[PDB]
Swiss-Prot record, chain A:
<protein>
    <recommendedName>
        <fullName>26S proteasome subunit RPT4</fullName>
    </recommendedName>
</protein>
<comment type="function">
    <text>The 26S proteasome is involved in the ATP-dependent degradation of ubiquitinated proteins. The regulatory (or ATPase) complex confers ATP dependency and substrate specificity to the 26S complex.</text>
</comment>
<comment type="similarity">
    <text>Belongs to the AAA ATPase family.</text>
</comment>
UniProtKB/Swiss-Prot annotation, chain B:
<comment type="function">
    <text>Acts as a regulatory subunit of the 26S proteasome which is involved in the ATP-dependent degradation of ubiquitinated proteins.</text>
</comment>
<comment type="similarity">
    <text>Belongs to the proteasome subunit S11 family.</text>
</comment>
<protein>
    <recommendedName>
        <fullName>26S proteasome regulatory subunit RPN9</fullName>
    </recommendedName>
</protein>
Swiss-Prot record, chain D:
<protein>
    <recommendedName>
        <fullName>26S proteasome regulatory subunit 6A</fullName>
    </recommendedName>
</protein>
<comment type="similarity">
    <text>Belongs to the AAA ATPase family.</text>
</comment>
<comment type="function">
    <text>The 26S proteasome is involved in the ATP-dependent degradation of ubiquitinated proteins. The regulatory (or ATPase) complex confers ATP dependency and substrate specificity to the 26S complex.</text>
</comment>
Swiss-Prot record, chain G:
<feature type="domain" description="MPN">
    <location>
        <begin position="8"/>
        <end position="143"/>
    </location>
</feature>
<comment type="similarity">
    <text>Belongs to the peptidase M67A family.</text>
</comment>
<feature type="modified residue" description="N-acetylserine">
    <location>
        <position position="2"/>
    </location>
</feature>
<protein>
    <recommendedName>
        <fullName>26S proteasome regulatory subunit RPN8</fullName>
    </recommendedName>
</protein>
<comment type="function">
    <text>Acts as a regulatory subunit of the 26S proteasome which is involved in the ATP-dependent degradation of ubiquitinated proteins.</text>
</comment>
């Protein structure tokens, strides 16, 4: 015929347009789930970090006993400190870096060694990519050095 | 299985109460069984270590999944002709049936 | 006369005494604080039933660190469980002082 | 191009554009339930973010102490038993009393050194040895990074 | 009517994948929740909606009384399909939820969708029906489960509750042919209800 | 009394990285803590700050 | 989940907290109080540092109907983070005097909160037993070898 469903599909064209932007509205709020999931992860570990207060570091001077250890702190004072029975008691030996509590002064845990930022500056200088070729003239001095 | 894998990207959210990833496992157990029919021990063993780790990851199992899992297991052990290993497995299968 | 007060002795229940300790050891060296939920009877007995802990500040303990907004929210949570009564003060924790 | 119109009568059929019109009536009922769900979901997230911000902003506020970063020690993200980078842990097993996450060692200006789990808001790329970082005045958690300070003899040179 | 707190019970069953309502009966009951929430809301803005499930061996509380449509929704998602609705336990759970309200002025009402021919005893649910009306709780049983053939256990239930009481029990039977659940629920009384004192 | 200090470095309070809270670099230029967020693109932390000893 | 379970270390504040919340609901005559259990876990020893009430109703005529408010628990947990943010949901206390088999059904609800298999702690409020007055249990799903199906 001439006209009798042309206009009726004019209406379903308007619906169709709106539907596909409703698809982009589904995807938009799904894009806000991820953005906000990261931003909650950084500020949630931040409250746990606030609530996990700093502990003072020493090193073991001298085992007195298997329950009593003498440490020299990094605040200065030598203490006789206890041990919490949640860490080793055989890796407390002299020269060993440990952190101890500030509010009952008991050893919380063993730590690897701790090395100064001045000696870390010295290691972070290792730059100069120049080869033994680049020493001209004094190549004899290189055999001798070796 | 492929069909099922593609199906769940769209269907799981539209229905939004129905999971289709339980189906993947049910199939997968049978893929392991089918190799034990063509007498491929190697291929079946690889699928059996994977079936087992998946089983454990869920915090609940249907009866039906763990049944299919004990079935692949049973056919494998009795080919090598290991008696003791078989017996123990079969008890697991019979109860949860 | 005006109104004339006399001695009181503060009766800290077993539940409250441990709670104060738990909160104070954990947030140290930083000063920790919290509100006292209780009831006041007699003219000689301040009954401190329970405490709870208010979020800490790096601005220590002060007029603006208490937070009355979080208090109003905390109060309703105690309201639904029958564990509200009426607020009888505050506590805070100094460390080595 | 665009479906459901007279152009498309020629390309498809009448019956096709109608079952399309009918199937999109199915589709749209589902999509109003999901958009509402996801809308509400981002609200719940945003409001717990503001709740977080008010604690952080108290600590961030002045004053705060000054420390440099001795070194970044490192500790495993295994909190489901123990730390074992190279230092095994003994006795009792813990979530986070000796099985903590990654670590920062700082040197304060009150003459000490403190071992803390590094803050989850400062990244481990912004911590490297010899950086100057702010630290909480009455605790010792790293709020932020600062540019290296100098002496006032040095600021005269400027 | 107005000033009324409503636990809607959504039925969850293995009969909720049926094509007797498009696309399935579960997803139709989803839309149905939304319309009733808004209706009550625009009559008077102090009304609240709670939502419970039938999924599970026993029903469960997913959401207590809230004025947020969106909280009700996170629940329907969370919920399965594989349980069975037992009316006796669903009623009892709805009543406990009803002893917690935004304001205590508000009346007590249960709306129950049925997609499961009832497998509970008739007699068990007669005792419970007499339990409801002491508190002033009426139950509107939207029946579309027993159109799969099953005798009307419900005639007894609606009748026992019914008495002088300004919250009224109602029996609505929905057309078995495809025609969209929610529409039919929305066009029947839910705000065009009347008292029966 | 007042504790006598002495300033050691003016570190201006914008461009100090005194906002880390906003972890987004998709918003802002991110050259400064007031340019961490570009909605205002302006004060979200004190204008000037100071390190004293 | 975690399968690491061994001991339940229990703090004295936990013991006292469940006696107190029971007595200030003034639940008696076999009416119960179920609250949240808070502490460290994902760990072999389950470490319960604190506990708080949750609004809870138990019907005594028919035991198969109970009230738990899901909304409260999330809110409440947020405020726990205020106190000490090393606490997450690791289970629930029961008010005793003993184990019930209706506890099996309660248990489902708290699996959408926890990172561990949920904790059941009987705090006996009448303080009966010749040692400690607490029994401690954890929910397991397992096949039964006496020829019957998988029980929880």
């Amino acid at each position: 015929e001439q006209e009798a469903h042309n206009k009726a599909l004019n209406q379903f064209k308007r619906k169709l347009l709106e539907h596909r932007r409703y698809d982009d509205q589904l995807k938009q709020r799904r894009q806000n789930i991820r953005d906000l999931e990261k931003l909650y992860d950084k500020t949630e570990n931040d409250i746990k970090a606030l609530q996990s207060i700093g502990q003072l570091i020493g090193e073991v001077m001298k085992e007195l006993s298997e329950e009593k250890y003498i440490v020299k702190a990094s605040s200065g004072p030598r203490y006789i400190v206890g041990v919490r029975n949640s860490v080793d008691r055989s890796k407390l030996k002299k020269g060993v870096r440990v952190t101890l509590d500030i509010t009952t002064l008991t050893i919380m845990r063993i730590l690897p060694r701790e090395t100064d930022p001045l000696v870390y500056n010295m290691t972070s200088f290792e730059q100069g990519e120049i080869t033994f070729d680049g020493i001209g003239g004094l190549t004899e001095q290189i055999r001798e050095l070796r | 299985k492929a069909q099922f894998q593609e199906l769940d990207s769209k269907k799981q959210r539209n229905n939004g109460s129905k999971d289709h990833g339980d189906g993947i496992l049910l199939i997968d157990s049978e893929i392991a069984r089918t190799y034990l029919l063509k007498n491929d021990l190697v291929k079946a063993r690889d699928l059996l270590d994977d079936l087992e780790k998946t089983l454990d990851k869920k915090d609940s199992i249907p009866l039906r999944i763990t049944n299919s899992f004990y079935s692949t297991n049973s056919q494998y052990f009795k080919f090598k002709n290991d008696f003791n290993s078989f017996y123990y497995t079969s008890l697991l299968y019979l109860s949860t049936l | 006369t005006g109104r004339d007060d006399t001695k009181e002795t503060v009766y800290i229940s077993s539940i409250a005494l441990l709670k104060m300790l738990k909160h104070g050891r954990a947030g140290v060296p930083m000063e920790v604080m919290g509100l006292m939920l209780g009831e006041f009877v007699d003219d000689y007995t301040v009954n401190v039933v329970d405490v709870f802990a208010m979020p800490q500040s790096g601005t220590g303990v002060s007029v603006e660190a208490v937070d009355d907004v979080f208090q109003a929210k905390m109060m309703d949570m105690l309201k639904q469980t029958g564990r509200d009564q009426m607020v009888v003060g505050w506590y805070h924790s100094h460390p080595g002082f | 191009g665009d479906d459901e119109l007279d152009q498309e009568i020629l390309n498809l059929s009448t019956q096709e554009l109608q079952t399309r019109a009918k199937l999109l009536d199915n589709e749209i009922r589902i999509f109003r339930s999901e958009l509402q769900r996801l809308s509400h979901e981002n609200n719940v997230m945003l409001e717990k973010i503001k709740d977080n911000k008010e604690k952080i902003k108290n600590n961030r506020q002045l004053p705060y102490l000054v420390a440099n970063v001795v070194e970044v020690m490192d500790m495993n993200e295994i909190e489901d038993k123990e730390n074992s980078e190279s230092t095994t842990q003994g006795g009792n097993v813990n979530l986070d009393n000796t099985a903590v996450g990654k670590a920062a060692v700082v040197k304060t200006s009150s003459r000490q050194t403190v071992f803390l789990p590094m803050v989850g808001l400062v990244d481990p790329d912004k911590l490297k040895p010899n950086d100057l970082v702010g630290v909480n005045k009455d605790s010792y958690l790293i709020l932020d990074t600062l540019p290296s300070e100098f002496d006032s003899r040095v600021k005269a040179m400027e | 009517m107005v000033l009324e707190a409503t636990v809607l019970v959504i039925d969850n069953s293995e009969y909720s994948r049926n094509g007797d309502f498009p696309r399935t009966r579960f997803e139709a009951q989803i839309d149905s929740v939304e319309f009733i929430f808004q209706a009550k809301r625009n009559s008077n803005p102090e009304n609240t909606v709670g939502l419970i499930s039938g999924a599970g061996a026993n029903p469960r509380v997913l959401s207590t009384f809230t004025a947020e449509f969106g909280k009700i929704l996170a629940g329907l998602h969370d919920t399965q399909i594989e349980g069975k609705l037992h009316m006796a336990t669903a009623l009892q759970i709805a009543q406990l939820t009803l002893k917690h309200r935004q304001n205590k002025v508000q009346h007590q009402r249960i709306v129950a969708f049925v997609c499961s021919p009832i497998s509970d005893s008739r007699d068990e649910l007669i005792r419970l029906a007499k339990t409801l009306k002491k508190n002033n709780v009426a139950v509107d049983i939207i029946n579309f489960g027993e159109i799969e053939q099953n005798t009307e256990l419900l005639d007894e239930f609606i009748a026992a509750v019914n008495n002088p009481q300004e919250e009224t029990s109602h029996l609505l039977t929905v057309t078995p042919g495809p025609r969209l659940l929610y529409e039919n629920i929305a066009s029947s009384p839910i705000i065009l209800e009347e008292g029966s004192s | 009394p007042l504790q006598v200090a002495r300033c050691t470095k003016i570190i201006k309070g914008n461009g100090e990285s005194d906002e880390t809270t906003t972890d987004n670099n998709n918003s802002g230029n991110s050259n400064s803590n007031s340019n961490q967020q570009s909605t205002d693109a302006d004060e979200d932390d004190e204008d000037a700050k100071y390190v004293i000893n | 989940m975690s399968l690491q379970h061994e001991k339940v270390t229990i703090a004295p504040l936990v013991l006292l907290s469940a006696l107190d919340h029971y007595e200030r609901t003034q639940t008696k005559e076999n009416k119960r109080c179920v609250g949240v259990i808070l502490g460290d876990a994902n760990s072999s020893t389950i470490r319960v540092t604190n506990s708080f009430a949750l609004p809870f109703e138990e019907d005594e005529k028919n035991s198969d109907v109970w009230f738990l408010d899901h909304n409260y628990i999330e809110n409440m947990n947020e405020m726990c983070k205020k106190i000490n943010a090393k606490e997450k949901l690791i289970g629930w206390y029961h008010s005793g005097p003993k184990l019930r088999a209706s506890d099996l059904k309660i248990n489902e609800l708290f699996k959408k909160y926890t990172q561990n298999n949920p904790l059941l702690l009987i705090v006996d409020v009448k303080q009966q037993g010749v040692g400690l007055p607490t029994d401690a249990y954890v929910a397991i799903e397992q096949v039964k070898d006496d020829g019957t199906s998988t029980e929880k």
